[PDB]
Amino acid sequence: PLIVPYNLPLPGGVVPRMLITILGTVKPNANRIALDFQRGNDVAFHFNPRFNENNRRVIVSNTKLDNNWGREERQSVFPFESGKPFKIQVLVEPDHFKVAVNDAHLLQYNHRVKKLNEISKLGISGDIDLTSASYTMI
């Protein structure tokens, strides 16, 4: 598999109709996964499945500006399974990131970082075997 943490450059930043596809397998006894869409040191979109927060499974989404985390957005619909293969699809739309897991819509995350062309890398980390990380224009 690919080395984790993995940096996927996004040349010239994100743009509407850009589709990012991550394929991997969750480790057995996973604690977390993280996708970090970055604008320099800022994190425009942090997508963070948590397998055991107070014995609950939750996805936390947030933005980091000037080294400070913002207001969390929490999704209790939790499509990831310890030990099992997954597909994350992130479609950039004009006003949000649109996330599907295993071909099922999961959540939208409204753009807080407005300079889309400056969000020029994606960090992939946490308790996975990473199979592939790629992008295409639809």
Ligand X SMILES: OC[C@H]1O[C@@H](O[C@H]2[C@H](O)[C@@H](O)[C@H](O)O[C@@H]2CO)[C@H](O)[C@@H](O)[C@H]1O
| Residues of span 19-48 touching ligand X by CB under 6 A | 46, 48
Q: Which strand ranges, in their side-by-side order, compose the sheet holding 18-26?
A: 104-110, 96-101, 85-92, 18-26, 128-137
Residue 60 partner contact from ligand X, Cl ion, none using kind-dependent CB cut-offs of 5 to 8 Å: ligand X
Peptide bond just before 9 cis, omega within 30 deg: no
Q: Which is nearer to Cl ion, 45 or 51 (CB)?
A: 45
Given 6, 13, 58, 135, the residue binding Cl ion (CB under 5 A): 135
Asked if residue 74 binds Cl ion (CB under 5 A), the reply is no
Q: Which is nearer to Cl ion, 38 or 51 (CB)?
A: 38
Print the binding letters for residues 83-122 with ligand X: x by CB under 6 A, - otherwise: ----------------------------------------
Q: Could you tell me the two tokens for 34?
A: 């993280």
Residues listed for the chain: 138
Asked if residue 75 binds ligand X (CB under 6 A), the reply is no
What CA–CA distances, in Å, run from 99 to 21, 45, 124?
10, 11, 15
Give, as one character, the DSSP assignment of residue 137.
E
Distance (Å, rounded) from C-alpha 12 to C-alpha 34? Answer: 22
Given 18, 59, 113, 128, the residue binding Cl ion (CB under 5 A): 113
